[PDB]
Design a protein around this motif. Structure first.
Motif, PDB file in Angstrom:
ATOM      1  N   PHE B  89      35.712  27.961 -19.196  1.00  0.00           N
ATOM      2  CA  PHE B  89      35.083  27.509 -20.060  1.00  0.00           C
ATOM      3  C   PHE B  89      33.282  28.647 -20.196  1.00  0.00           C
ATOM      4  N   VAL B  90      33.284  28.853 -21.503  1.00  0.00           N
ATOM      5  CA  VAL B  90      32.255  30.250 -21.594  1.00  0.00           C
ATOM      6  C   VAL B  90      30.828  29.521 -21.444  1.00  0.00           C
ATOM      7  N   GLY B  91      30.419  29.374 -23.191  1.00  0.00           N
ATOM      8  CA  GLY B  91      29.154  28.096 -23.272  1.00  0.00           C
ATOM      9  C   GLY B  91      28.447  29.194 -24.454  1.00  0.00           C
ATOM     10  N   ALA B  92      27.194  29.551 -23.892  1.00  0.00           N
ATOM     11  CA  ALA B  92      26.383  30.131 -24.835  1.00  0.00           C
ATOM     12  C   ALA B  92      26.735  31.578 -24.489  1.00  0.00           C
ATOM     13  N   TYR B  93      27.192  32.218 -26.021  1.00  0.00           N
ATOM     14  CA  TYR B  93      26.294  33.312 -26.104  1.00  0.00           C
ATOM     15  C   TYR B  93      25.065  33.924 -27.773  1.00  0.00           C
ATOM     16  N   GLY B  94      25.928  34.933 -26.611  1.00  0.00           N
ATOM     17  CA  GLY B  94      24.912  36.043 -28.497  1.00  0.00           C
ATOM     18  C   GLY B  94      23.325  36.232 -27.912  1.00  0.00           C
ATOM     19  N   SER B  95      22.846  36.668 -28.663  1.00  0.00           N
ATOM     20  CA  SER B  95      21.238  37.359 -28.680  1.00  0.00           C
ATOM     21  C   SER B  95      20.475  36.231 -27.555  1.00  0.00           C
ATOM     22  N   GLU B  98      17.462  33.945 -29.221  1.00  0.00           N
ATOM     23  CA  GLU B  98      17.575  32.886 -29.884  1.00  0.00           C
ATOM     24  C   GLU B  98      18.290  32.127 -29.063  1.00  0.00           C
ATOM     25  N   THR B  99      19.107  31.887 -27.794  1.00  0.00           N
ATOM     26  CA  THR B  99      19.614  30.909 -26.864  1.00  0.00           C
ATOM     27  C   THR B  99      18.762  29.680 -26.695  1.00  0.00           C
ATOM     28  N   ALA B 102      18.692  23.741 -25.032  1.00  0.00           N
ATOM     29  CA  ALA B 102      20.318  23.412 -24.469  1.00  0.00           C
ATOM     30  C   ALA B 102      21.444  24.141 -24.457  1.00  0.00           C
ATOM     31  N   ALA B 103      21.320  24.917 -24.696  1.00  0.00           N
ATOM     32  CA  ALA B 103      22.552  25.293 -24.926  1.00  0.00           C
ATOM     33  C   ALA B 103      22.685  26.360 -23.410  1.00  0.00           C
ATOM     34  N   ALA B 106      23.562  22.994 -21.333  1.00  0.00           N
ATOM     35  CA  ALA B 106      24.941  22.737 -20.831  1.00  0.00           C
ATOM     36  C   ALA B 106      25.480  23.673 -20.258  1.00  0.00           C
ATOM     37  N   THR B 107      25.473  25.131 -20.393  1.00  0.00           N
ATOM     38  CA  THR B 107      26.420  26.146 -20.177  1.00  0.00           C
ATOM     39  C   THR B 107      26.117  25.997 -18.394  1.00  0.00           C
ATOM     40  N   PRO B 149      27.939  37.151 -21.149  1.00  0.00           N
ATOM     41  CA  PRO B 149      27.595  36.726 -21.848  1.00  0.00           C
ATOM     42  C   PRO B 149      26.071  36.068 -20.968  1.00  0.00           C
ATOM     43  N   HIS B 150      24.995  35.866 -21.661  1.00  0.00           N
ATOM     44  CA  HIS B 150      23.627  35.899 -20.750  1.00  0.00           C
ATOM     45  C   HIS B 150      23.912  34.594 -19.622  1.00  0.00           C
TER      46      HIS B 150
END
Lengths: 244, 266
Positions: B89-95, B98-99, B102-103, B106-107, B149-150
């Motif tokens: 499982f990875v979950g939230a990614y990107g900048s 704008e995270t 909720a993301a 959940a992660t 990801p962060h």
């Protein structure tokens, strides 16, 4: 003037980080003893800085390191800050072909010089009950792949000796720390020797009296936060992989 | 051969990837395996494949389900010897700008809360035994930035901290806590579909300084090493399996070593 009337001894003081540190510590009010093997450049900088003196010192020779400490004491009666610095790389190329002579010559400057500096500066400082011993290591002292083999071993050794010495000297009132410049950026601007000088002055100041055995890394985050590699994860519209 | 003979292991995320490889290898090493996952069809199929394995539906983000999986291991086998906190499982990614919260939540619910619940409830069973091994599949992203990801990176760092923290409590009770940190690639994280298996092998090949791909079976073997009696004084450790990237640089980053041997300076 964060080092007003402090006495600092800076090795490799005639160029690069060493010269920047001698200049900044003098500007911060310290009496500076400049130690180096470049006599002409060392004397010129001693003439430039107020109340600084030059002492020829090959840090691979223990007697010369002891003599530099002794000269600092003869001139000023105390030693507040020791900076073990060398603008030196030594052996390069494949580990398969590195001679023992090149290995030993590299460690003689980059590691023995630090041991001699800590040993003899600590002798002066434990009598005072105070003092700051600082070594200019490198990010090659915290991970591999950033410098030659002998360089990387010596610099790891300097971080180990920094921590070990601190464990003996802290109850004596003496701090031992290291700065780890990058081998130079994610921030796009170039690292200057003056910034390493400023990190050393921070560590020598009373503000840092409870910073001990620490390795202050100045490398724009490369060793712990590679910005190029992160782009594939971060430089994207925010999204979510998997079930919410 | 049979390093876990008649030991009882609970493996979460067991229906695929590292979790499935770990369930298979621990069963091969003689363990009774409880397979925990939310993928019922894959989980039940693997349980049918392995001798003495059973499936227990488990969403590790829900503490009650983690506790119930431990209880299931105890009901079936009377003890729990090894707990594996694993999630594919990875979950939230990107900048980060704008995270969403909720993301973010959940992660961390899967990657961090799930590990806490697993350590908590496995340890409850294990301190009674006076023995046991709690293992978490972290990542190289738990050891430095720039490798995931962060939220992933923060969660995996937290898992290593919780690993160390729990070990300091549980060690005098006879219970060990360790982690394994596989290397990963963004392809393995992102690429899913029918060719996803080979895409990840290709990606892992180019990323390894050793030039060969990391396979899930190798992480299974690292976990079995840590659970075995050989590792009875390995505790609070993060066993890194990444071809040396975190401590010796990415592939091709040190070609200067191959220059002709020389000496520069005085």
């Amino acid at each position: 003037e964060r080092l007003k009337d402090r006495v600092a001894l800076v090795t490799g003081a005639a160029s690069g980080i060493g010269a920047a540190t001698a200049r900044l510590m003098a500007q911060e009010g310290a009496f500076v003893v400049l130690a180096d093997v470049d006599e002409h450049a060392g004397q010129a900088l001693a003439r430039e800085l107020r109340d600084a003196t030059f002492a020829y010192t090959d840090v691979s020779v223990e007697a010369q390191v002891a003599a530099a400490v002794d000269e600092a004491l003869r001139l000023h009666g105390r030693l507040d800050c020791m900076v073990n610095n060398a603008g030196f790389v030594g052996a390069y190329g494949s580990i398969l072909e590195t001679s023992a002579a090149a290995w030993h010559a590299t460690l003689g400057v980059l590691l023995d010089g630090v041991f001699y500096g800590i040993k003899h500066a600590a002798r002066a400082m434990v009598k005072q009950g105070s003092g700051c011993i600082l070594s200019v290591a490198s990010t090659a002292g915290v991970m591999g792949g950033l410098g030659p083999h002998a360089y990387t071993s010596a610099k790891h050794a300097v971080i180990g000796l920094t921590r070990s010495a601190a464990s003996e000297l802290a109850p004596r009132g003496v701090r031992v720390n290291a700065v780890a410049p990058g081998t130079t950026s994610p921030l796009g601007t170039p690292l200057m020797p003056q910034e390493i000088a400023a990190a050393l002055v921070y560590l020598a100041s009373d503000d840092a009296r409870h910073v001990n055995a620490h390795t202050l890394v100045v490398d724009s985050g490369v060793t712990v936060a590679g910005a190029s590699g992160g782009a594939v994860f971060h430089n994207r519209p925010a999204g979510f992989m998997g079930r919410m």
